[PDB]
């Protein structure tokens, strides 16, 4: 009846809410942010502690030893430090993020210590693993094999808040999503490995997504889908694809930012402070002059007469006299500015959409086409759909370890029926429902 | 502390829920349906009564006299019978429907009796009156006049349940909505009166609605918009238009039903019972024969090679061996069949969308363009968005009469600030929020 929550950020609130329901558990919180933990301590009954992880490893060892379990909501680079302290004191751990190559090396030490460390919980990774292995295990129960697996996913505003140039509102820092456009995408399709080129030409891979006629969606592939054959155990499959969902026009607007030279890690140009109008003059080539002058230069740079991309920049105030926020690069300067202009208000709803699609070959010979829809909306006077889908799987898994339901030991994901079965059933009560459909056509 | 709710239908549940919160009020229910009032009596504490209105007018007079207020949730043709009983016994009334020409004749008798009768509450009519007069009164507070008023509105499935040929699910009987396609539409636009022809050519008036880029909507005008100049007191306006919202493809599918000859009140054709395949053979002209034969005849009748309309009929089972439900006409037979195929399940969400747009001329000379968005989703384990928007205004208005907030007397709508102000503020807490925006551009 004692837990440590390392991290006082976005995901912490729904985790603290779920754990402090019965009343028996005693929650401790450790963080860098002094302002966050005070505001967080007002809402929920917790023991506040202030500490850095990589500098104050001495007190972490003593603090972890007092607890029954340790929940890590920190950046994924810092998990080996938290994992090392857990194996020494013989305490269980749960994580809401990737099991990195660095964390994988400890697996021998974690098994010898005789403790449980559950990684890759949340939305992605997390629910995508659980929904996949539910259907795959159901197929293997009747001797069937997987031929295809297509999975698109996506967090975005509720339709009523989609009227802006990007059709988007940022939950956290845009640096991650903006840099994904420059990266490559790899997947398997009808036997052949397909490579997609990132950067300026990545817009060519964007396709229309019409499974909901009322919802105007687009889609494109993720970083890597070929690694999931080994993870789920479906190397017999001829198709393996994972994608992302957005409203139509999103990627064309980001394509406009790539043309102008805003998506890079070069430093900002050096009496009077720098403005956005002045920054775009430097990028195009002209001197800091009139607003109508740089307008003619900007539209010339943005392909032909692409007024849509020009008006998108004009709307955000990129051809304007506002001050550029201080940052270590041009990309970071844009990211801070987008958080200012396109963030969620107090009463505005977010939304999660997910679409799985399986091609199952039964031993009879026929082909089953199975599809799963998961949809969830944010609450007005409550938690967001993104906060719930990332927070609740990690929180539910922690309660299962304390109550003693998960018997397995070592380092692992949520791939076993012991883990995913109980979690998928409990998220229905929290307002995360998923429907299933199935048809046959050899 | 005593109320009679005449009607045990769709709207009754949220009305009974709202009124029985404090506990002081005693609710009585009168209805034709014996099964409904038993099931309704299980959930909420009520006094059940069974009676017909036009046959048992004797007991209605005695029953109404016992109460402080009478809520009528019956068909609008029966309001003069309920109104006549109210004026005799000197009791207040509220209605969730139109104030008809028949009910308007009693206005002299209602004023002499010295009681309040509030009509035209709900969604439409109801909230449309309240949202209109809120903005119009705010304009007249600063000496401004109304030049334009455009109002589109619409109840429909949540985007995730829009994957069917009509992109729709019916809350009640389709007879009303199907017959609106055959009727005309009239409105004012830039000084000139516009008439729109109903029936086969009504599809030409359908336009794209792009105020939410994420939501794929279409729109078309309502029956009559010219009567609203006198109601709101905006005869100076050069534009008056009210429309309906649907997902794209809805009206093209209904256009297909008009071509085949399904939208009419002719009787059904007369050992073996009638099937849908046999009915479409009679309508096209051929004899009851093979399925592929009538398929070639049906596509020939549906304009050129319109496979979309053909597949829509095939999906619903109109070229199939299912039995036709018993009804007094072909339109009624279709309506019953659509309720069977396209109704809401237990866990499926509905949705309400509304969009007002004002052109306000200030005495300075400038033009203010004001817009109001109202959006609401149905609850999973609760009431639908349609049930809430129709039920709660009538229920809230009833509580204001009992508590003694509405001082005005006679027959009236919800046009006064005394009525609409308190209701618009209280619906926010129930999950019906509306945002406002305003810009200037002479």
Swiss-Prot record, chains A, B:
Sites of N6-succinyllysine modification: 43, 55, 104, 252, 277
Saccharopine dehydrogenase: region residues: 1-442
Residues bearing PTM N6-acetyllysine: 43, 55, 104, 227, 259, 277, 296
Tissue and organ distribution: Expressed in all 16 tissues examined with highest expression in the liver.
Induction: Induced by starvation.
Binding annotation for NAD(+): 8, 32, 36, 53, 74, 96-97, 123-125
Subcellular location: Mitochondrion
Superkingdom of the source species: Eukaryota
Binding site for L-saccharopine: 97-98, 124, 223, 244-246
Connected disease: Hyperlysinemia, 1: An autosomal recessive metabolic condition with variable clinical features. Some patients present with non-specific seizures, hypotonia, or mildly delayed psychomotor development, and increased serum lysine and pipecolic acid on laboratory analysis. However, about half of the probands are reported to be asymptomatic, and hyperlysinemia is generally considered to be a benign metabolic variant.
Summary of the function given for this chain in its UniProt record: Bifunctional enzyme that catalyzes the first two steps in lysine degradation.
Family the UniProt entry places it in: In the N-terminal section; belongs to the AlaDH/PNT family.
Subunit structure: Homotetramer.
Notes on the domains: The N-terminal and the C-terminal domains contain respectively the lysine ketoglutarate reductase and saccharopine dehydrogenase activity.
Protein name: Alpha-aminoadipic semialdehyde synthase, mitochondrial
Species: Homo sapiens
Gene field: AASS
């Amino acid at each position: 009846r004692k837990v440590l929550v390392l991290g006082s950020g976005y995901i912490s609130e729904p985790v603290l809410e779920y754990l402090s329901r019965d009343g028996n558990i005693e929650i401790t919180v450790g963080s860098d942010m002094k302002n966050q933990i005070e505001q967080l301590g007002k809402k929920y009954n917790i023991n506040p502690v202030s500490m850095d992880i990589c500098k104050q490893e001495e007190k972490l060892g003593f603090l972890v030893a007092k607890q029954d379990l340790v929940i890590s909501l920190l950046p994924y680079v810092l998990h080996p430090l938290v994992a090392k302290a857990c194996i020494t004191n013989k305490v269980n751990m749960v994580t809401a993020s990737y099991i990195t190559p660095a964390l994988k090396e400890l697996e021998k030490s974690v098994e010898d210590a005789g403790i449980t460390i559950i990684g890759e919980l949340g939305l992605d990774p997390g629910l995508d693993h659980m929904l996949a292995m539910e259907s795959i295990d159901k197929a293997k129960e009747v001797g069937a094999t997987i031929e295809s697996y297509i999975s698109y996913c996506g967090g975005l505003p509720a339709p009523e808040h989609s009227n802006n140039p990007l059709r988007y509102k940022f939950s956290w820092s845009p640096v991650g999503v903006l840099m994904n456009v420059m990266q490559s995408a790899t997947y398997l399709l009808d036997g052949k490995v397909v490579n997609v080129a990132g950067g300026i030409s990545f817009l060519d891979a964007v396709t229309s997504m019409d499974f909901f006629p009322g919802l105007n969606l687009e889609g494109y592939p993720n970083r890597d889908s070929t690694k999931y054959a080994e993870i789920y155990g479906i190397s017999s499959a001829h198709t393996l694809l994972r994608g992302t969902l957005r409203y139509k026009g999103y990627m064309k607007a980001l394509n406009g930012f790539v043309k102008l030279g805003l998506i890079n890690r070069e430093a900002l140009p050096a009496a009077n402070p720098l403005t956005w109008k002045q920054l775009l003059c430097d990028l195009v080539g002209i001197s800091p002059s009139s607003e109508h002058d740089v307008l003619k230069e900007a539209v010339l740079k943005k392909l032909g007469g692409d007024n849509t991309q020009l008006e998108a920049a004009e709307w955000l105030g990129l051809l304007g006299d506002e001050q550029v926020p201080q940052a270590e690069s041009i990309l970071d300067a844009l990211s801070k500015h987008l958080v200012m202009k396109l963030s969620y208000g107090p009463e505005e709803k977010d939304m999660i959409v997910m679409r799985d699609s399986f091609g199952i070959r039964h031993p009879s010979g026929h082909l089953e086409h199975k599809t799963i829809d998961l949809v969830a909306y944010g609450d007005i006077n409550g938690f967001s759909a993104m906060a719930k889908t990332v927070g609740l799987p990690t929180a539910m898994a922690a309660k299962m370890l304390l109550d003693g339901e998960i018997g397995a030991k070592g380092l692992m994901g949520p791939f076993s029926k012991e883990i995913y079965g109980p979690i998928l059933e409990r998220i229905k009560a929290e307002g995360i429902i998923y429907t299933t459909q199935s048809t046959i056509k050899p």
